[PDB]
Structures are given as C-alpha cells and as structure tokens.
Write a structure and sequence with these properties.
The complex is a heterodimer of chains A (217) and B (216). Chain A is mainly β and 217 residues long. Chain A folds into two domains: 1-124, Immunoglobulins (Immunoglobulin-like, Sandwich), CATH 2.60.40; 125-215, Sandwich (Immunoglobulin-like), CATH 2.60.40.10. Helix content of chain A is 0%, strand content 55%. Chain A is built from no helices and 19 strands. Chain A has strands spanning 2-6, 10-11, 17-24, 32-38, 45-51, 57-59, 67-72, 77-82, 91-103, 106-114, 118-122, 131-135, 139-149, 155-158, 167-169, 173-174, 180-189, 198-204, 209-215. In chain A, strands 2, 4, 5, 6, 9, 10 and 11 form a seven-stranded mixed sheet that branches. In chain A, strands 12, 13, 15, 16 and 17 form a five-stranded antiparallel sheet that branches. With 216 residues, chain B is mainly beta. Chain B is built from two helices and 20 strands. Chain B is elongated, with a radius of gyration of 21 Å. The chains are: A mainly beta (217), B mainly beta (216).
C-alpha cells in the first residue's frame, strides 16, 4: 500500500488549504484514515480521522471549526480541507492509514502506513526579489544578509563562485511578514581584507533576480 | 503540555537509551496506553510500539525487541527503552496518547547516537548594517557553528532583559566539517537598536552557554 499527499504548496491567509491523499495497492472503504501535520522544527499534531466504511469523522477539538475530511472511493482518495488558515497551518502534512488490533478485547488504534508528507506554506506574500545587506567583519568572518524574498529558493556564491573555502550558507527562515530570510558567511584571512574584494552573489530564480553585494570592512 | 518530552538526548553506540514521556498531573499514567513513533530526517514517523502494562502492549511489525515500552509511576511517565544503540537509531522519537476524542502528541525527543567528539559552539553576532538601517530596518544575525551534538537553544537579550518577539531560528544542520551549524535572527526597528545599550545572542549547548554581545 502506498499513500501520496498532493496539493498546493502555498496558501494565502484566511483562504482554504486543500490536500488529497492518493492511495494505491489498497482500498479506502476497508480502513480508517487520518491526517497529521508537523510545523517546521516542531512536533506532530493529529488533525482528524475518517472511517472508510461509515464515512463518520473525528476532528481535533482545537481545530474543529477548520477541518473537513472526506473520501472519494471512486478514485481511491481521501481529502483534507482547512478553512481560514493562518501562519499556524504552515506545516508538513501527512496522510495515514490507521492500524487496528484487539488486545484483551480492547481496541487499539495506531498510525500504521504513512505518506511521504507535503509542505504547505501559509503566506500572503507575492513573488519578491531579495534585499541584500553586507555583514561587515588571524581570520575574519564576513557575510551577506539575504532579506525579505519570496518564494524559495535562493542560491549564494562568493566572488562569482571563485570563493568556496570557508563558505557557509544557512537555511532560510520564514518571518512573520510571510517573507524569507537567510545569511551566507565566509571566513577569510584578516590580512586579505585590505587587498581582496569580497562579493556575495545572490540568485533568486523565481523573481528572475540576481543581486551582487560588495562586502567591505 | 499534556505530554512532556526532553527536547534532545544523546548516548553512545551499544549503550541504552531511556526516553521519557511525562503526562501532566491530570492524566494518571496508569490509565493510559502510550504510543511511540520513530522519525528519521525527511521521512515520515514509524510506529514502534504501544505500552499500557506488561499484559497489555504490542510491538510494531518489523520493530526489533530492543525497542520496548515501560512506565514510571512515581514520575507519571511513559518510557521508551532502547538497548544496543546503533547509529541508525538516531531519530526524533514521538510519544502519543488518546484522550476525549483526540490524539495528543509530545514535542518529540531528538536522540543522537554519538559518532564523533562533542564540541561546544562558536558564535558570531552581526549588528544591523548601515545600509539596512538606512532602509529603515534592523536585523541582528547570530551565526552558530562547529557544535556536536546538533541540538542547541538560542535566547536573545535586550540589555539584560530577555526578548522573544521578532526571533527566528533555524534547525541545526551539518557543514563540510561534519559538525552542526545554525542561525538565529532578531528583528528590530532602527530606533529600538539605537536606544538600547546592548543586545546579546545566547546559545546553550549541553553544559555550556556561549553569549556574544553587540552595541550601537
């Protein structure tokens, strides 16, 4: 049995998050199913469950007003609908087939078969190129701050790719504004600061923008 | 929370891991079945087992006997015991219980199986650039590197007072030297930045805390 979550990776706040779980090598009608999500860097949260046989549902009480979980036996799918989303709904979403076993005549349910999960990001932001600011400096650390761009990704190089040693580019953060930010840093000899030119090259393909920032002491 | 798990834990290969899942006092652990899941990077969680008592428990299919469940009544906690630790056992371990029409999850414990020497983090803190300030913005950038295991906590301070608002922090990831690095940001207004004596980025890693401070 294989589960594959599908749906838009981006949803605007107050709008509706919709996701479909395609199931192969198994029948929807003969099992119970659940949606579970995991915000970046956080723990798991059970959204809700549905009985493939009765169609009855059980939603997380803290999410009651948002959740709709339905089934489509025709195409062997089951879907999730989250209305009026906010930044709290940014997460990796998993569709799951529940396991069931009887122990001492007691029913035990667990999360048995999992899909790979899909990231859904909530942001009101539209496509926007980055603003690049210099992070001015034995050895010396200098960098550039790649601020307020959307969407991911960007790539960073130094001196058009001629500088790779000691270069470290960090993962992006999602700010409360709905825009991304990251930083790249390189460690260079202090004596090179007055002789060598250091430029960070930032490439943001989604907006077709490249920004080069000369970083000076 | 209902279920409290340590954020991280580390142990040596071949040793034993004891992962705790502490239930808040309204939830007597003796009354609940504790479910455990194992999650490896970029991959969905995997059902390990559930445990209620010695006579009421079940192992997940394909899950070796070295993974076992137990309870600590005096601590009101569910336990996941792992013997003969292998490097592959490195994962995020989640506990869960069922209560009143809903599943409740713990925060998950990141277990590291030690595979290299421990190392305290190096910290570099950048003040807002002149260019950013002139664009009516201010960002403090705290770069953290060269640490192992890959679990740290980041706290920001305005003068000596803690600051939570405007903080974003990345999950630690390995660099080319096989050690971990992460980054944290503090967003400020130019006036906030200029009106304070100093701001600090404070990083905790196991028994050490490293703090860097910048001033306008």
């Amino acid at each position: 049995v294989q589960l594959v979550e599908s749906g838009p990776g981006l949803v605007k706040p107050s709008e509706t998050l919709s996701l479909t779980c395609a199931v192969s090598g198994g029948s929807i009608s003969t099992n119970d199913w659940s949606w579970i999500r995991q915000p970046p860097g956080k723990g798991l949260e059970w959204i809700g469950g549905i009985s493939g046989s009765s169609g009855d549902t059980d939603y997380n009480p803290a999410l009651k007003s948002q959740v709709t979980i339905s089934t489509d036996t025709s195409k062997n799918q089951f879907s999730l609908k989250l209305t009026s989303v906010t930044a709290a709904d940014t997460a990796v979403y998993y569709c799951v087939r529940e396991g069931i076993v009887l122990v001492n005549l007691a029913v035990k349910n667990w999360f048995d078969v999992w899909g790979p999960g899909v990231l859904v990001t909530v942001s009101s932001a539209s496509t926007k190129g980055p603003s690049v600011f210099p992070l001015a400096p034995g050895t010396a650390a200098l960098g550039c701050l790649v601020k307020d761009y959307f969407p991911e990704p960007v790539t960073v190089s130094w001196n058009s790719g001629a500088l790779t040693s000691g270069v470290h580019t960090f993962p992006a953060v999602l700010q409360s504004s709905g825009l991304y930010s990251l930083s790249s840093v390189v460690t260079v000899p202090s004596s090179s600061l007055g002789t060598q030119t250091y430029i960070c090259n930032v490439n943001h393909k989604p907006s077709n923008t490249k920004v080069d920032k000369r970083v000076e002491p | 929370p209902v279920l409290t798990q340590p954020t991280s834990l580390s142990a040596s290969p071949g040793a034993s891991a004891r992962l705790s899942c502490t239930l808040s006092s309204g939830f007597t652990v003796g009354r609940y079945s504790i479910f455990w899941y194992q999650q490896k990077p970029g991959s969905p969680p995997r059902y390990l087992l559930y445990y209620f008592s010695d006579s009421s428990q079940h192992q997940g299919s394909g899950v070796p006997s070295r993974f076992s469940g137990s309870k600590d009544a005096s601590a009101n906690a569910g336990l996941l015991l792992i013997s003969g630790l292998q490097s592959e056992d490195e994962a995020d371990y989640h506990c869960a219980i069922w209560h009143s029409g809903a599943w409740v999850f713990g925060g998950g414990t990141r277990l590291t199986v030690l595979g290299q020497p421990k190392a305290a983090p190096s910290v570099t803190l950048f003040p807002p650039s002149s260019e950013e300030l002139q664009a009516n913005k201010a960002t403090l950038v705290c770069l953290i590197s060269d640490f192992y295991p890959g679990a740290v906590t980041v706290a920001w301070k305005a003068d000596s007072s803690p600051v939570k608002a405007g903080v974003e922090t990345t999950t630690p990831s390995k660099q080319s030297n096989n050690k971990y690095a992460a980054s944290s940001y503090l967003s400020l207004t130019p006036e906030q930045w200029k009106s304070h004596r100093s701001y600090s980025c404070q990083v905790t890693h196991e028994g050490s805390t490293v703090e860097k401070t910048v001033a306008p």
